[PDB]
């Protein structure tokens, strides 16, 4: 059921490779090692269609040059940059990205998580395809801004999507009832409905034997099916905290209980997080 | 691309009826109104496959009786219970399960965003079907015998997901590498790898060295691709907080600093939440 991911590792150190081979000890991962920059650049051309994921150690000599050249040949694949070795003279960081935007950055002792990080590196690529490189997607051919008009990244994205992805069934929420799609009036009545609901949660949050959890569910339900981002929930919390803040200055004590109301935010977001986690099916 | 939802509502109040009618005024919702228990029993028993959701007012006369007869007949459908019982408290959201374990509880003043709650009832029934009910189970342990028509709740559940569902591509995570599937040794091994990653976050929090986006995204990738429950993340937090509570209680410092790290837990869960939310295949 699981497709084989082909890994191309560029490493100079003995200790770094030794961890990568150890982590990806499963026979699912095709490991191809290149112990020099020139070996990578040459393997890049001969096996450009045989690379699923890259692991580029920054501590490797002439790093940016190998990366700059790599984007020229059209080689744009999922990557995992390891460790920190910023060049001192290119004078064009940036550092928003070394290779491409959907690249992953790891530590030299965070390699026993590689199987999960390889998954992340592949999934991120599929979601942001086509991505932008600090070597080709800005210059030169041909303003603007890539030599892949038929989307060479999508020809790869489709190829990875069918092997590393499956097909499941989700509950189709009404997109016309999402917060960002609702009419302006409808949008802020729901927003007020969520503000009211949240206040109800907060006011009875430290009230035991209450409908607190039933109040949370009914808020999270509105939050989940209107596809509101977690930021809005965080924003709703603030608008009430501001209200309570001013309320406490006069006719009340200090604003210390607001710090106790951080539990309320953790509580609600946790519910919402689980509901999204529960809404993921299997292949069948 | 949205299937109609047949809603049967048992209400004997001219006020609540209008509140539901205004909330479900959309063309998607097929409203069927029964203004007595006998009428509900009559309609349900001859339209068993034509009820997608029940809206039951708990304060209705002979409520226990009607629901029980509904339950024994096998009419177990998605449901929203409105208000509380008439024995003998006033009107607020219900407290105990009155119909089945996938039911929803709403107060009489929380009917404004009823469309989102109908989605929640339907979805929760699908998730829990076949659902434990609060009658035909019978009960105090006064059972008698048949039947076992378990197909009924399953036939309905599958029928609803064939109407209230859609197909989307999802990254084929490795279920064998999920936290709940790993053997006891490898289970606690990954648990420590995540404990180390989370500690990396707590320390780098409020610096900022640091690249807090990288350190958190590193942790969230593991929690996601290992399908780690949100309860584990909180568990990791309090475990680490337990250690830090000890430190401060020895260097003579205050545990007041622990309050500020609730922000850390908010930050990580929010990130985890958006990871699941982003991965939801949307067709708009």
């Amino acid at each position: 059921m699981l497709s084989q991911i082909a890994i191309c590792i560029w490493v100079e150190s003995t200790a770094i490779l030794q961890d990568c081979q150890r982590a990806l000890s499963a026979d699912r991962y095709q490991l191809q090692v290149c112990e020099s920059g020139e070996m990578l650049l040459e393997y890049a051309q001969t096996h450009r269609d045989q690379i699923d994921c890259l692991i580029l150690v920054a501590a490797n000599p002439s790093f940016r040059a190998v990366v700059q050249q790599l984007c020229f040949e059209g080689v744009v694949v999922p990557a995992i940059v390891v460790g920190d070795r910023d060049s001192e003279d290119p004078d064009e960081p940036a550092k928003e990205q070394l290779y491409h935007s959907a690249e992953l950055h790891l530590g030299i002792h965070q390699l026993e998580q590689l199987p999960y990080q390889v998954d992340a590196a592949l999934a991120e690529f599929l979601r942001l395809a086509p991505v932008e490189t600090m070597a080709d997607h800005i210059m030169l051919m041909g303003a603007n801004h890539d030599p892949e008009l038929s989307s060479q990244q999508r020809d790869l994205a489709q190829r990875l999507q069918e092997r590393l992805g499956y097909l499941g069934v989700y509950y189709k929420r009404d997109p016309d009832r999402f917060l960002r799609n609702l009419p302006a009036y409808e949008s802020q009545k729901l927003h007020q409905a969520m503000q009211t609901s949240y206040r109800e949660i907060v006011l009875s949050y430290f009230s035991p034997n209450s409908n607190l959890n039933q109040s949370i569910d009914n808020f999270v339900n509105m939050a989940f099916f209107a596809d509101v981002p977690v930021t809005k929930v965080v924003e709703i919390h603030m608008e009430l905290m501001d209200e309570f803040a001013k309320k406490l200055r006069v006719e009340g004590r200090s604003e210390d209980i607001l710090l106790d109301y951080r539990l309320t935010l953790i509580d609600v977001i946790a519910h919402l997080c689980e509901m999204y986690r529960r809404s993921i099916p299997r292949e069948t | 691309m949205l299937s109609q939802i047949a809603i049967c509502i048992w209400v004997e109040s001219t006020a609540i009826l209008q509140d539901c009618q205004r909330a479900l005024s959309a063309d998607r919702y097929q409203l069927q109104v029964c203004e007595s228990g006998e009428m509900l029993l009559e309609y349900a028993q001859t339209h068993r496959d034509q009820i997608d959701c029940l809206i039951l007012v708990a304060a209705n006369p002979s409520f226990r009786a009607v629901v029980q007869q509904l339950c024994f007949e096998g009419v177990v459908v998605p449901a929203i219970v409105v208000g509380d019982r008439d024995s003998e408290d006033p009107d607020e959201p219900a407290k105990e399960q009155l119909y089945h374990s996938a039911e929803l509880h709403l107060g009489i003043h929380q009917l404004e965003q009823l469309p989102y709650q109908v989605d929640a009832a339907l979805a929760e029934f699908l998730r829990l079907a076949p659902v434990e009910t609060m009658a035909d189970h019978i009960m105090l342990m006064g059972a008698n015998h048949d039947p076992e028509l378990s197909s009924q709740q399953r036939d309905l559940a599958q029928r609803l997901q064939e109407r209230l569902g859609y197909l989307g591509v999802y990254y084929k995570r490795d279920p064998d590498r999920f936290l709940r599937n790993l053997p006891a040794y490898e289970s606690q091994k990954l648990h420590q790898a995540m404990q180390t990653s989370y500690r990396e976050i707590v320390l780098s929090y409020f610096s900022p060295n640091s690249n807090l986006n990288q350190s958190i995204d590193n942790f969230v990738n593991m929690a996601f691709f290992a399908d780690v429950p949100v309860t584990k993340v909180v568990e990791i937090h309090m475990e680490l907080m337990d250690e830090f509570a000890k430190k401060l209680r020895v260097e003579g410092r205050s545990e007041d600093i622990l309050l500020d790290y609730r922000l850390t837990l908010i930050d990580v869960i929010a990130h985890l939440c958006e990871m699941y939310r982003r991965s939801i295949p949307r067709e708009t």
Binding site: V234, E255, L258, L259 | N213, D217, H271
Partner: peptide, 20 residues
Amino acid sequence: DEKSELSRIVRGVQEKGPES
């Protein structure tokens, strides 16, 4: 005030994380 300020920093990364 301060609570609003520290809740805003949590929003900040969601705006500019590893996503669009």
